[PDB]
Write a protein that binds this ligand. Structure first.
Ligand SMILES: NS(=O)(=O)c1ccc(-c2cnc(C(=O)N3CCOCC3)o2)s1
Ligand SMILES: [Zn+2]
Length: 257
């Protein structure tokens, strides 16, 4: 019953999920002047060359491109992380308009969308166990702005017709997530949470400073998705983002001077 409407949206989540008001909630505003460069942060290691995508799913909140995470095939390492985190899925959050849509903000600036590459700590055996741990997940966040098209996003865009409504899925093999990365891997990092219910406080957030550009046509196709199931009243899947939450007792660290 939670969602993003006037009656079930982020302001309501705390009633079913009291951790919504917790001590390490995401997303947050990234105050670029207050984030501290941390020279002890390792370079980030993104190893996606062996990635195996399987499926794309409209889950009624966003769409997930899911990966085979039954072996170490696509991993995130280094940066603030100890150990090996395996890619399980990626998805996006986006707006009804180019001026909003991202979950994280940068000096209060909202981007048109935000990509989340979700990884789980292999020390915990599977995703389900990992989300119960303070260091269970690493989500790589990448901002999208509207400008030139992102060629590597287009295979995703073109399959969206086939998963228009909640619960629809489609085969989605041989998609290469390296096509969605910016040039630079400079990042901010802080400890936080899933940004949707159950809002578990299990994520090390790694948010890239460099946005990717997508075209107006690409983002328009995101906005044609539906929150509803087939044969239900059409509600466009837009504004599926949670706003910035209080930073509280946390420091955001920068990987770069
Ligand atoms: N916006 S976010 O913070 O990146 C995020 C919010 C919720 C996520 C979630 C929950 N379950 C999964 C998942 O991929 N699985 C694993 C178990 O639940 C169903 C499928 O992802 S990922
Ligand atoms: Zn997300």
């Amino acid at each position: 019953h939670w969602g993003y409407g006037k009656h079930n949206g982020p302001e309501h989540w705390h009633k079913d999920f009291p951790i919504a008001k917790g001590e390490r909630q995401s997303p947050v505003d990234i105050d670029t002047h207050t984030a501290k460069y941390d020279p002890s942060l390792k370079p980030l290691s993104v190893s996606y060359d062996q990635a195996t995508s399987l499926r794309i799913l409209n889950n009624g909140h966003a769409f997930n491109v899911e990966f085979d995470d039954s072996q170490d095939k696509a991993v995130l390492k280094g940066g603030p992380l100890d150990g090996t985190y395996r890619l399980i899925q990626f998805h996006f959050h986006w707006g009804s308009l180019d001026g909003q849509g991202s979950e994280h903000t940068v000096d209060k600036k909202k981007y048109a969308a935000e990509l989340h590459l979700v990884h789980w700590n292999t020390k915990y055996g599977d995703f389900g166990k990992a989300v119960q741990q303070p260091d269970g997940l690493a989500v790589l966040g990448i901002f999208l702005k509207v400008g030139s098209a992102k060629p590597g996003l287009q295979k995703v865009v073109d399959v969206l017709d086939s998963i228009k409504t909640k619960g629809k899925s489609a085969d989605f093999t041989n998609f290469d997530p390296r096509g969605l990365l910016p040039e630079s891997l400079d990042y901010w990092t802080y400890p936080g949470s899933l940004t949707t219910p159950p809002l578990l406080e299990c994520v090390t957030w790694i948010v890239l400073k460099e946005p990717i550009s997508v075209s107006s046509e690409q983002v328009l196709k995101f906005r044609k998705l539906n929150f509803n199931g087939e044969g239900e009243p059409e509600e466009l899947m837009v504004d599926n983002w949670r706003p910035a939450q209080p930073l509280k007792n946390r420091q955001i660290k920068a990987s770069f001077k």
